[PDB]
Amino acid sequence: FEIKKICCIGAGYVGGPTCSVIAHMCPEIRVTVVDVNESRINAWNSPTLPIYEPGLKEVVESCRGKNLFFSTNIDDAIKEADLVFISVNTPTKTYGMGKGRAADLKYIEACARRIVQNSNGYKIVTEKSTVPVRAAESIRRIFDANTKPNLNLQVLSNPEFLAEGTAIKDLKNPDRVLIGGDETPEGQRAVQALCAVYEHWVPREKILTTNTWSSELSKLAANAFLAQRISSINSISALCEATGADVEEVATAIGMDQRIGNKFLKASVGFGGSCFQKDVLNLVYLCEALNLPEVARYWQQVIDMNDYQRRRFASRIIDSLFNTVTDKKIAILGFAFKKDTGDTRESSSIYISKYLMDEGAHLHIYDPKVPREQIVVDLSHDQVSRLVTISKDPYEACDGAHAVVICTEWDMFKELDYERIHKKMLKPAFIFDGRRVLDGLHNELQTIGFQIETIGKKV
Amino acid sequence: FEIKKICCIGAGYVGGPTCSVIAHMCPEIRVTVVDVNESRINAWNSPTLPYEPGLKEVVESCRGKNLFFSTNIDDAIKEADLVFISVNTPTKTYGMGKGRAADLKYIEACARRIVQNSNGYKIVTEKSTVPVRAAESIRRIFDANTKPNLNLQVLSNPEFLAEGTAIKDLKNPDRVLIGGDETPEGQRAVQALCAVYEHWVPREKILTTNTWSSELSKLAANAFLAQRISSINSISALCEATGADVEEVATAIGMDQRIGNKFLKASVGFGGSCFQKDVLNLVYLCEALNLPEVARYWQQVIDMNDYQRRRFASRIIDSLFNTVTDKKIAILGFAFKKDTGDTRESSSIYISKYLMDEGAHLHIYDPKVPREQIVVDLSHDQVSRLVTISDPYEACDGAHAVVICTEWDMFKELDYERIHKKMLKPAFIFDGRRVLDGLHNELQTIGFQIETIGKK
Amino acid sequence: MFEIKKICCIGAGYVGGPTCSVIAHMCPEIRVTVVDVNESRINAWNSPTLPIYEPGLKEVVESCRGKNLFFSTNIDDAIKEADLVFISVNTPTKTYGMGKGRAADLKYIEACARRIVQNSNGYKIVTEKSTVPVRAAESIRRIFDANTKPNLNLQVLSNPEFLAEGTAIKDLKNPDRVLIGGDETPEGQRAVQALCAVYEHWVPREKILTTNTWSSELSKLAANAFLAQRISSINSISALCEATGADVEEVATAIGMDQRIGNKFLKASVGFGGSCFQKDVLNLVYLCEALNLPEVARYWQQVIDMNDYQRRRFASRIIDSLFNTVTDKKIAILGFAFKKDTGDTRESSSIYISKYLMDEGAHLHIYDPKVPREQIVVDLSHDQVSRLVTISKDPYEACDGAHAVVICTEWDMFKELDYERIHKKMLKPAFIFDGRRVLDGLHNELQTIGFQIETIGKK
Ligand SMILES: NC(=O)C1=CN([C@@H]2O[C@H](COP(=O)(O)OP(=O)(O)OC[C@H]3O[C@@H](n4cnc5c(N)ncnc54)[C@H](O)[C@@H]3O)[C@@H](O)[C@H]2O)C=CC1
Ligand SMILES: NC(=O)C1=CN([C@@H]2O[C@H](COP(=O)(O)OP(=O)(O)OC[C@H]3O[C@@H](n4cnc5c(N)ncnc54)[C@H](O)[C@@H]3O)[C@@H](O)[C@H]2O)C=CC1
Ligand SMILES: NC(=O)C1=CN([C@@H]2O[C@H](COP(=O)(O)OP(=O)(O)OC[C@H]3O[C@@H](n4cnc5c(N)ncnc54)[C@H](O)[C@@H]3O)[C@@H](O)[C@H]2O)C=CC1
Ligand SMILES: O=c1ccn([C@@H]2O[C@H](COP(=O)(O)OP(=O)(O)O[C@H]3O[C@H](CO)[C@@H](O)[C@H](O)[C@H]3O)[C@@H](O)[C@H]2O)c(=O)[nH]1
Ligand SMILES: O=c1ccn([C@@H]2O[C@H](COP(=O)(O)OP(=O)(O)O[C@H]3O[C@H](CO)[C@@H](O)[C@H](O)[C@H]3O)[C@@H](O)[C@H]2O)c(=O)[nH]1
Ligand SMILES: O=c1ccn([C@@H]2O[C@H](COP(=O)(O)OP(=O)(O)O[C@H]3O[C@H](CO)[C@@H](O)[C@H](O)[C@H]3O)[C@@H](O)[C@H]2O)c(=O)[nH]1
C-alpha cells in the first residue's frame, strides 16, 4: 500500500507550506489543502499568498493546478484521500477551565468528527498540529466509537518542526522527521506508508519512528528547550546591564562550547510567535494534571523570564523618557515576531506597543511585511484611533519622534540613515535597540547625538 | 610586551595541567608553578604526580628545562612577567551568603602576596572561578598598595577543562577566553597573554572580551550546561508519568541542531565540584544586584536537581514497601561520574544520606573511590552504625535493593543471575544512570524488579 | 467448611491483649497465643499485675489464661502452630526520614510479615489488625508471593479494630460492626468466611461487614477522622461560646438532638489525645498528597490544627489568668491520662499543657490515679523535669501551696475533692482551670469559696 492522495485540513502556516513541499517533491501524489476560511483559500489560489514565507510562492506556483490544490470543499477532499493531515490551530484556551494555560482542542475535535463522518475504507489520519500528550488517543477513541463496516482509520502523530521565515529550507532539508504510531501491525504499516512519503526527499536515517505519546512529548519538549535558551540568554542580558558585561560577548564565549552550541543565543526584547509560549504553557498545564508541581514550576520560569524581559524593556523606554511618555511620538520599527515573516502572533512588538499605549504615547509603526490591518487588530480591544499611526516608511515614523524602538531584526533597520533621522527627532533623541542590530554603530550614533540603549549592554 | 617568565599560584587541577601544557607547547617560556603545600610540590617533581591521561608524559617532557615546581612563592612572583591566580575558591560556610557565595580569602591572600613581592610591570591573570566583578577587588588592592614603577595589569582567563580529559581539552580547546580592561594598558596585557596561547591555539579560537564578560562567561557556561541536565531530568519525570522513554525523547530533541545532542543524558542528578557551586554563585550575585527574577530563574536549575535526587530516593523507599529501616541496600557507585574516583557533590552522597536518615544499612562499593573519602563525605558516628564499605557481589549479599548511582562500565557485565539468588525477595534494582538499558528483559526474567530514570 | 482452631497474635499491646482475651473468652475451643518481642510486657501479662489498665480486662484474662489464652515471647513457635495470625503491632507516625511527622512508620509491620513467612508452612490466614495506610496489605501479599515455599498458602486479610481504650472489653464484646477485607478470589472469600465464623460465636452476622482489603483500610482511617472532627468541631464552638457568652454544653445539647448529627462525641475538651486520632488523620493527609488531592489534605489537616489551637489556647489562658507569668509558680495538674479509665498517656493533652507550662518555668505537681509515675517522667523528659516536675501521691499534696489547679482528665474523683480544704492551703488568688467540664454544677460553690474558676466553653 502506497499513499497517492493526501488531504490536509488547515491551510495556515503549517498546512500550506508542508503540503506545497510534499507536492513539489512527490509529483505522483495529489495533495489537497482545505480550510473553512474561504478568503485564505482564495488567496492561496492567487498571485498573492495569504502568508509571507521566502520561496513559498515559487514552490506553490510550480505545483498548483497540477498536483497541489487549495479548496474549501473539506468533505470531498477527505473521502478521496488516503492520508489526512490535521494541521489546524491549537491556541491556548482563553476561557473556562485552564484559561491562559491549557491547549484549546476544539478545532482538532471538529476535524476528527468530520473525518469519521466522511470516511469509508482505509485512511491514515495524521495529527501534525502540536497537541497535549495523549491527544492522539482521543482521536482513536472517537474513531473506535464511530466505526462502520470496512472502515479502517489509523491515527499517527507527525509533529512539525519548521520555523517560520525559513519554512521552505526547513521542509526541504529537515533536521529530522518524527512519526508516532501504535506498536501493532496496522500501526507500523501505517507508519511505514507515511515514511515512504517523506523518503522521496528525506534520508531514512533522518526519519524517527516512535509511539504516539513519545512523539507528542518530544515536540513540546523541543519547543520548551528552544524557548529556554532564549530566556536563559535574556536573563544573562539583565545581569549584563547590571555588571558592565556584554551579552553578545557572553553568548559568543558560551556558544563556542560545543556541548552548548551557538544557536539560539541572541538576546532580545522577548520571544514571540504563535507556539513558544502556548507550548511551554501546555507543558506546564500537563505537569499539574500528572502531579508534577516541581516540573511545572521549572518550565514556568521560561515564560516568567520572557514576560520580565518585555516589561523591563518597556520600563527602560519610559524611564529614559523622563518617566512620562504621554503624548510623545515614538517610532516602533518592526512589528513581525521575527524577520522574514508577516506573522505577528504573540510578537514582542504587540506587548511593547501596548505598554507604551497604556502610558499615552503616540505610536508610529513601520514594518516592511506586516499588513496595515493586522497591526490595528493586534492593538485593538478606541485607544488605537487616538494613539496609533501605521507608517508607510521608517522615516515618517521617526519624523518628530522622541524615541526609535527597534523590535524586529529586519536587515533594513541596520542600514537606515540615522543623521537624517536625528535631524528631525525631538531632543534629546533616543534609540532603544531591542534586537542588538545596531552593534558596531554605537559610536557613530553617539557622535550624531543619539542616546542609544540596547539589551545586554550597560548604559 | 613579550611574556618570557610565567609564575602560577596554585598547583591544583587547574594550576599544573594548564602550566605543564603551556611549558610543553612554549619551549622558550620559563614556567614556574608554586604552591603553599610542599608535599604537593614534591609530588609534582616525583615519579607519582599528585592523575590525568597524558599528563605524566607532558610533565616529564619539559620539567627542569622550562618547567619548574617550587615552594618558593616570592621569587617566582618577583621575576615573573605573568602571574596566574589558580587557587581554590570554596563556598562560604558561614556568614552572609552562607553556602552559596564564594569565599575570596584565598584570592585576596594571593593579591596581597603578589603586590608585596612585585616591582615594575607584571600581568596578573585570574584563572580561578570567581564572582563577576572580582577583578575590581584585585585592582583595588593593587591600587591601594602602589609603589613607584609598580604596574600590575589584571586580566581574567577562566578555565573550561573537564576532569578526566584535561590534556585533550588543553592541547585542543574549544576556545581560550581572555578578558581585560578596554583600555590601552588592558589591551597590551591581553595581546601578551594571547601570544602565549598562540603557540598552539589558532587565533580563531582565542576570544578576547572585557573583564566582566570573561568572568560572567565562565559562570554562565556552567549554568547552561547544568540547565540542560536539569531540563532533561525534568523531562525524565514526565516520561515516567506518560509512558514515554527519556532516551527516545532525548534523541528526538537533540537532533534539532539548534539544540545539539550533548548533555542530554538523564541521570539521578549532576555532581561535580562546580555546577552547583557556580549556579549558586550566580544566584547569590543576582540577589545582590537586585535582580530577583534572574535569581529565581537560575535557582530552578538547582531545585530541579535536588528534586531529581529526592524523588529517586522516594522511589526506592516507596517501592520497598514504604520502609527501609534495618534493610541492607547496596550502593554500586559513589563517584560523581564514571572512570574517576572524585566524589564532590556526587549524587550517591545525597542518595546515601537520604537512606541513612531512614535507618537503612548501606553497603557501598566503588572501584576507584578510596574508602576513607566515602566515610568523610557521609559524616558531620551514625556512619559506623549504618555504612559498611564493600567488591560489588558482597555489597549485594542479602540485600533488598541494588542502587546504581554512577555509570561504571563494570556494572553492565555483572552476574545478576548469581546476585539474585543471594538477595532477599522481592529483589529490586534501581538504575539512576540508564546503564542497564537493553538488559531489562533479562532482569525481569531473573525475577529481579527493575526501575530506572525515565521509563515505565 | 474450614475451621480456625489456633490463633496467634503478634503484638501484646492495647489491641492484641484485649482482642485475643475476648476471643479466648467467647470461643473456648480455640487456642489463642499472644506474643511480643517485649519480654517485660509479656511477663506482666503472665502476672497478677497486667501491663495495661482496661476496666474488666483482669477478670477476662484470669478466667482464660492457661486455659486457652496464652502469652509468650516464643514468637516463632506460635506462628507455626497457628491457623490465623493477627498482626497487631504499632504503626506510629514517622519521627524521621521522608514523611516525618505525617506518614505512618511501617517498620514493625514488615518485620512481622517477614518473620511469619520465614516461620510458616502449609495453610494459614494472616490478618492485619494494625491501622495501616491504604494498600499496605498489598505489600504483605507481595512479600509472601516473593518468598514462596513448596506448600505455602498464606491468605491476607484486613480486619481493622474499633475498640476505644477505657471501654475496650464492652466494645469487643458488643461491637457496632466488625470489618473484614479480603480478595475476591475464591480462596479470598473462603478466608474471609473462616474469620467470620470466629466472630460469629458472639457477634451477630448482620454486624459483620465484608469488603476488599483497600476499602477496609480506608474505612478505618476515615472513621477516626470523622470522630476526631466532631471533637474539633465542638472545640471550635467552645471558643465561640467564650467570645459570645453562650454555653458550649447547652449548645452541644441543641446540636445533638438533631438525629442526623447525633449526640455522641460532642464533649468539648482541652483537646483530643490518644495514640491514634492524630497519627491517623495525618496518615490520611499524607495519603492525599501522594494521590494529588491537596484540597482533601488541607481539609483534614484542619482537624489537627484546631486540636493544636485548643490546647495552646488553654495553656495561654492559664498563663494570662495568672497575671501573665507562671515562672516559679506551683501549679497542680490533675489528670495525666489521655482520657479516663486508662493508664495510657499516648498523645495526652496533659503532656502538651504541662510542656507549655514547663516552658514558662512553672513548677508542676502532677496527680493521676492510674498513670504510673515512671511514665509521667518519660513523657515530660528530653533535666528540665528534675527542676520543674513533681509527681504527687494524692491530689491535696499537688494542690498544697499551688496558685492554680488544672484539670486535664475527666476522672470522676475530681468532682469529689474537698475544695474548701484545697482553697485554704493554696496561694492567693486561687484559680481552677477545668479543661474537661467536670466541675459544672459546682461553679457557684467554688466561687463563694473564693476560687476563680475558668472552664472550656464558658465566658
Ligand atoms: N506556525 C508554525 O510555525 C508552526 C505551528 N505548528 C502547529 O501547527 C498547527 C497549525 O498552526 P498554524 O498553521 O500556524 O495555524 P493557523 O491559524 O495559521 O492555521 C490553521 C488553519 O486551520 C483552519 N481550521 C481550523 N479549524 C478548522 C476546521 N475544523 N476545518 C478546517 N479548517 C480549520 C483555520 O481556519 C486556519 O486557517 C498548530 O498546532 C501549531 O501549534 C507546528 C509547527 C510550526
Ligand atoms: N576543578 C575544575 O574542574 C575546575 C575548576 N576551576 C576553578 O579553578 C579554581 C581552582 O580549583 P582547583 O584547582 O580544583 O583547586 P585545588 O584546591 O586543587 O587547587 C588550589 C591550589 O592552590 C593552593 N593555594 C590556595 N590558596 C593559596 C595561597 N594563598 N597561596 C598559595 N597557594 C594557595 C592550594 O593549596 C592548592 O594547591 C577554582 O576557583 C575552581 O572553581 C575552573 C575550571 C575547572
Ligand atoms: N490502642 C488503641 O486504642 C487502638 C489501636 N489500633 C491499632 O492497633 C495497633 C497496635 O496498637 P497498640 O496495641 O496500642 O500498640 P502498642 O505499642 O501498645 O503494642 C504493639 C506491641 O507490638 C510489639 N511489637 C513491635 N514490633 C514487633 C514485632 N516485630 N514482633 C512482635 N511484636 C512486636 C511492641 O513491642 C508492642 O508491645 C496500631 O496499628 C494501632 O493504631 C486500632 C484500634 C485501637
Ligand atoms: O536566538 C534567538 C532565537 C529566536 N528568538 C526569537 O524567538 C522567537 C521564535 O523564533 P523561531 O524559533 O525562529 O521561530 P518560530 O516560527 O516560532 O519557530 C519555532 O516554533 C515552531 C512552532 O512549533 C517550531 O516548529 C520551530 O522549530 C521553532 O523554532 C522569535 O520571536 C525570535 O525572534 C530570539 O529572540 N533569539
Ligand atoms: O548528559 C549528562 C552529562 C553530564 N551529567 C553529569 O553532570 C556532571 C558534570 O559532568 P562533567 O561536566 O563531565 O564534570 P566536570 O568535570 O565538573 O566539568 C564541568 O565543570 C568544569 C568546572 O567548572 C567545567 O570547566 C566543565 O566545562 C564542565 O563540564 C557529572 O556528575 C555527570 O555525571 C549528566 O547527568 N548528564
Ligand atoms: O466527645 C469527646 C470524645 C472524646 N474526646 C477525647 O478524644 C480522645 C479520643 O477518645 P476516644 O475516641 O474515646 O478513645 P480512643 O482510645 O482514642 O478510641 C479511638 O481510637 C481508636 C483507635 O483507632 C478507635 O478504635 C476508636 O474507635 C476511637 O474512638 C480522648 O483524649 C478523649 O478524652 C473528647 O475530648 N470529647
List, as one string, the DSSP characters of C185-229.
SHHHHHHHHHHHHHHTTTS-GGGEEEE-HHHHHHHHHHHHHHHHH
Q: Which H or E run contains A432? A: strand A430-433
CB C48 within 8 A of CB C77: no
The DSSP result for C106-139, as a single string, is: -HHHHHHHHHHHHT--SEEEEEE-S---TTHHHH
| B159 labelled catalytic | yes
Specify which residues A403 forms β-bridges with. A330, A430
Exposure letters C313-324 (e unless 16+ CB within 10 A, then b): bbbeebbebbee
CB C126 within 8 A of CB C138: no
User: What letter does residue C440 receive in the DSSP assignment?
Assistant: T
Closest by CA position to A234, among listed A250, A211, A257:
A250
Contact C299, C266 (CB under 8 A): no
Compute CA A449 distance to the chain's CA centroid, rounded to the nearest angstrom: 37
Same-domain check for residues C266 and C405: yes
> Could you give the maximum distance between any two Cα atoms of chain A, in Å?
79
Please list, residue by residue across C223-245, b when 16 or more beta carbons sit within 10 angstroms of its beta carbon and e when fewer do. bbbebbbbbbbbbbbbbebbeee
Å between B286 CA and nearest CA of chain C: 32
Measured at the CA of A423, the angle between CA A421 and CA A424, to 5 degrees, comes to 75
What distance in Å separates the CA atoms of residue C60 and residue C25, rounded to the nearest whole number?
7
Please report which residue ranges of A81-120 form alpha helices under DSSP H.
Answer: 106-118
Q: Is A424 annotated for ligand binding?
A: no
- Whole-angstrom distance, CA of residue C417 vs CA of residue C331: 17
Q: Which of C212, C233, C265 is the last residue of a domain?
A: C212
Point out the residue among B323, B326, B425 whose CB comes nearest to the CB of C147.
B425
Contact B244 A133 (CB under 8 A): yes
Q: How far apart are CA C128 and CA C89, in angstroms?
A: 9
**CB-based contacts of A260, cutoff 8 Å, min separation 6:** A254, B221, B224, B225, B228, B260, B262, B263
Known binding residue C36? Answer is: yes
Residues B151 and B104 in one domain: yes
Cell numbers representing residue B72 in the block: 618558593
Question: Which residue in B322, B425, B426 is closest to C106 by CB distance?
Answer: B322
Residues C9 and C58 in one domain: yes
Residues C181 and C222 in one domain: no
Separation CA A353–CA A120 (nearest Å): 51
* Alpha carbon distance B431, B333 (integer Å): 11
Dist. CA B409 → ligand 5 center (Å): 18
**Do residues A9 and A111 touch, judged by C-beta distance below 8 A?**
yes
C278 assigned binding-site residue: yes
The dihedral over CA atoms of C95, C96, C98, C100, expressed in degrees to the nearest 10, equals 30
Ligand 1 centroid to A273 CA: how many Å?
Answer: 13
Angle at A169 between CA A168 and CA A171, to 5 degrees: 60
Take residue B214 and report the three cell numbers written for it. Answer: 570573561
Residues A279 and A224 in one domain: no
Q: Identify the three-state secondary structure at position A43.
A: helix
* Cα angle for residues C414, C418, C420 (degrees, 5° grid): 130
Q: Which of C8, C9, C64, C276 is catalytic?
A: C276
Judgement on whether residues C12 and C25 belong to the same structural domain of the protein: yes
Check: CB of residue B428 under 8 Å from CB of residue B396. Answer: no
Q: Are residues A228 and A288 in the same domain?
A: no
Between CA B395 and CA A204 the distance in angstroms is: 46
Residue type, B359: G
Contact A454, A430 (CB under 8 A): no
SS percent in chain B: helix, strand, coil, step 5: 45, 15, 40
Nearest-CA neighbor of A332 among A316, A304, A354, A303? A354
Instruction: Verify whether the Cβ–Cβ distance C105 to B313 is below 8 Å.
Output: no
After which residues does a break in chain C occur, C–N more than 2.5 Å?
A: 382
Question: Residue C377 in 3-state DSSP?
Answer: helix
Q: Are residues C224 and C105 in the same domain?
A: no
C221 & C299 share domain: no
- Tell me, using a 6 A CB cutoff, whether residue A11 lines ligand 1: yes
Closest residue by Cα to residue B454 from B253, B290, B277: B253
Starting from the edge strand earliest in sequence, which strands make up the sheet with C208-211, in order? C69-72, C31-35, C6-10, C84-87, C123-128, C153-158, C178-181, C208-211
Q: Which of B314, B321, B425 sits opposite C98 (nearest CB)?
A: B314
CA distances from A290 to A303, B6, B233, B237, B245 (A): 20, 58, 16, 10, 16
Cell 472513621, located at residue:
C223
Alpha-carbon distance of B407 to B428, in angstroms, equals 18
Which three-class secondary structure string do you get for B300-360? HHHHHHHHHHHHHHHHHHHHCCCCCCCCEEEEECCCCCCCCCCCCCCHHHHHHHHHHCCCC
Q: How far apart are the first and last CA of chain B?
A: 63
In this structure, what C-alpha cell is assigned to residue C47? 502476672
Which letter does DSSP use for residue C99 in this model? T
Please state whether B237 falls in left (phi above 0), alpha (psi between -120 and 50) or beta.
alpha
Count of other CB atoms within 10 angstroms of residue B172: 11
Q: What is the DSSP letter of B417?
A: H
Contact A455/A436 with Cβ under 8 angstroms?
yes
| Residue-by-residue DSSP string for C292-351 | T-HHHHHHHHHHHHHHHHHHHHHHHHHHHHTTT--TT-EEEEE--SSSTT----TT-HHH
Residue C30 CA to residue C81 CA, distance in Å, equals 12
Distance between first and last Cα of chain C: 63
Work out the minimum CA distance from A452 to partner chain B, whole angstroms: 19
Look up C8 and say whether it is catalytic.
Answer: no
Yes or no: say if A98 and A90 are a contact pair by the CB < 8 Å rule: no
Instruction: Give the residue from B394, B383, B388, B400 showing the smallest Cα distance to B316.
Output: B400
The three cell numbers of residue B105 are 580569602
Ligand closest to the CA atom of residue A270: 4
* Distance set, CA C361 to CA C318, C330, C385, C390 (Å): 13, 10, 10, 13
> Which residue's alpha carbon is nearest to atom 3 within ligand 5?
B263
Neighbours of B202 (CB within 10 A): 10
Q: Closest Cα to residue B437, out of B248, B271, B261?
A: B248
- The secondary element (H helix, E strand) that includes residue C179 is strand C178-181
CB contact under 8 A, A257 and B225: yes
Q: For chain A, after which residues does the C atom lie more than 2.5 Å from the next written residue's N, i.e. where is it broken?
A: 381
Whether residues B151 and B231 share a domain: the answer is no
Angle between helices A212-243 and A247-255 (to 10 degrees): 130
How many domains is chain C built from?
3
Place of cell 474537698: C418
User: Which of B122, B127, B218, B455 is labelled catalytic?
Assistant: B218
CB contact under 8 A, B259 and A222: yes
Query: Amino acid letter at B320?
Result: L
Residues A414 and A292 in one domain: yes
The domain boundary, picked from A193, A211, A229, lies at A211
Pocket of ligand 6 contains residue C224 by CB under 6 Å? yes
Distances (CA, A) of A80 to A30, A67, A124, B28: 10, 14, 12, 79
3-state helix vs strand vs coil in chain C, percent to 5: 45, 15, 40
Cα B160–chain centre separation: 10
Q: Measuring CA to CA, how many Å separate A126 from each of A154, A212, B57?
A: 8, 11, 59
* Closest residue of chain B to C136, computed from CA coordinates: B321
Residue A273 makes CB contacts below 8 A (sequence gap 6+) with A164, A337, A338, A343, A345, A346, A347
Q: Smallest Cα–Cα separation from A429: which of A320, A353, A352, A324?
A: A320
**DSSP-derived secondary structure for B285-301:** HHHHTT-HHHHHHHHHH
User: Distance between CA atoms of A190 and C214, rounded to whole angstroms?
Assistant: 43
- Ranges assigned E (strand) in A345-417: 362-366, 388-390, 403-406
Q: Is A334 exposed, middle or buried (0-12, 13-18, 19+ CB in 10 A)?
A: buried
Among residues B101, B170, B127, the alpha carbon closest in space to that of B12 is found at B127
Residue C138: all three cell numbers together: 498489598
Amino acid identity at B343? T
Give CA separation, B342 vs A359, B367, B443, C189, in Å. Answer: 57, 11, 30, 58
Cis peptide bond N-terminal to C429, omega within 30: yes
Quote the cell numbers at residue C401. Answer: 501551696
Cβ(A128)–Cβ(A89) below 8 Å: no
Q: What is the β-pairing status of strands A329-333 and A207-210?
A: unpaired
Distance between CA atoms of A26 and A14, rounded to whole angstroms?
A: 18
Q: B158 and B281: one domain?
A: no
Last residue of a domain, one of C212, C232, C255: C212
Q: Which amino acid is at B376?
A: V
Domain that holds residue B385: 243-456
Which CATH number goes with the domain that contains B236? 1.20.5.100
DSSP string of A186-205, one letter each residue = HHHHHHHHHHHHHTTTS-GG
| Alpha carbons C445 and A37: distance in angstroms, whole number | 90
Cell of B417: 543471575
Q: What's the rounded Cα separation, in Å, for the pair B282 and C359?
A: 43
Question: What span, in angstroms and rounded, lies between the C-alpha atoms of A208 and A181?
Answer: 11
Report the CATH number that the domain containing residue A1 is assigned in CATH.
3.40.50.720
SS3 C454: strand
Residue C261 pairs with which residues in a beta bridge?
Answer: none
